[PDB]
Amino acid sequence: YFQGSHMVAHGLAWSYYIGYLKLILPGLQARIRMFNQLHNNMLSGAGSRRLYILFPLDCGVPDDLSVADPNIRFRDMLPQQNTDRAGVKNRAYSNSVYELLENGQPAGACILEYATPLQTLFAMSQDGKAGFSREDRLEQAKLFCRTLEEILADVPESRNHCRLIVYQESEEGNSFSLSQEVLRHIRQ
Amino acid sequence: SHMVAHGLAWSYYIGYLKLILPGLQARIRMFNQLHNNMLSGAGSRRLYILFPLDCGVPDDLSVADPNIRFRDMLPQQNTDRAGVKNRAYSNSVYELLENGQPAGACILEYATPLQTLFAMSQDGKAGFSREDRLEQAKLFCRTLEEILADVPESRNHCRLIVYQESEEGNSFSLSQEVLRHIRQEEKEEV
């Protein structure tokens, strides 16, 4: 295996930064402050004010987080950002806030989502026209993560809000609890 | 199958066109009720997507060509996506002017992934040459065409407008380029 120079993953990483994260990081905290005004400071500490992105390396990305763990419960959306983009007026960028339950009660809350490009990788893997194996998919998923981390390293601290939660579903165990993992990241 | 452009083409199809194209006609019908049948013919069926091969992608179409005039948005599509509840997908409708008056109307936008290719070309960290940016941009278009070819439902609901300004390269008008496509299809209809 020789890793190519500009692979699918490289492009996805750059896409994900240039076309989302870079766009939303400047206003994220303002949106959070607004949310807190409505929700009695639900997102109180710094740890609850990060943008946590789930990165399942097997690329299983359900649209509903509660599917992954029923202890991840949707609470409300942040106020949305609207931006004119590439001829689409008022394109909307949105994020969702979840409560993390322990014993049926909220133990934390945070902004949580999956990394969307992992959906692309999964779909490519399922289409013969794509020419893309399961082995290719895993490697690309790992490369996407590494490349993204490299790009994010260069963000100034005032915009250093992304936090990646990287795991491989097949390697975890029946005792893996995604909500606990997220709470662990919040707590660190 | 491991070039950047492949990923971009699949991203664009899987995460956008596949999602929105099936619902488009209904959104159009509603727009037309609201706006007195502004969209007609294939303008009432297709999303028109601009693919500038040089990867210059202005956010404002009127800046690109003042004869492209924004008129209103389609009603939005909201879909839960990857843990984002009610992610919103929105498209913009424009009138195209000729000699100062409306000559056509359509749903129009740029293919956003070209913006990624442009950005990669400008950041040394990407190690991505201008020459490769061009090749990849061409490849992105071809790949998307290939993907669409096998899915009539999607293919029939979009129009790819591919051009390289600077090979155009003189009297080029973007509005005229769009109108040319609209008119070609109009001649087929009826």
Ligand SMILES: Nc1nc(=O)c2ncn([C@@H]3O[C@@H]4COP(=O)(O)O[C@H]5[C@@H](O)[C@H](n6cnc7c(N)ncnc76)O[C@@H]5COP(=O)(O)O[C@@H]3[C@@H]4O)c2[nH]1
């Ligand atoms: N989580 C998230 N929420 C967003 O609002 C979002 N916006 C973009 N992205 C992900 O960022 C990267 C860059 O997005 P870009 O717009 O260049 O390409 C996008 C873009 O050309 C288009 N598209 C997606 N949603 C919209 C939309 N609402 N309007 C226009 N084009 C859209 O289809 C491509 C694939 O979209 P996703 O597969 O969702 O992944 C994107 C992509 O990996 C987002 N991811």
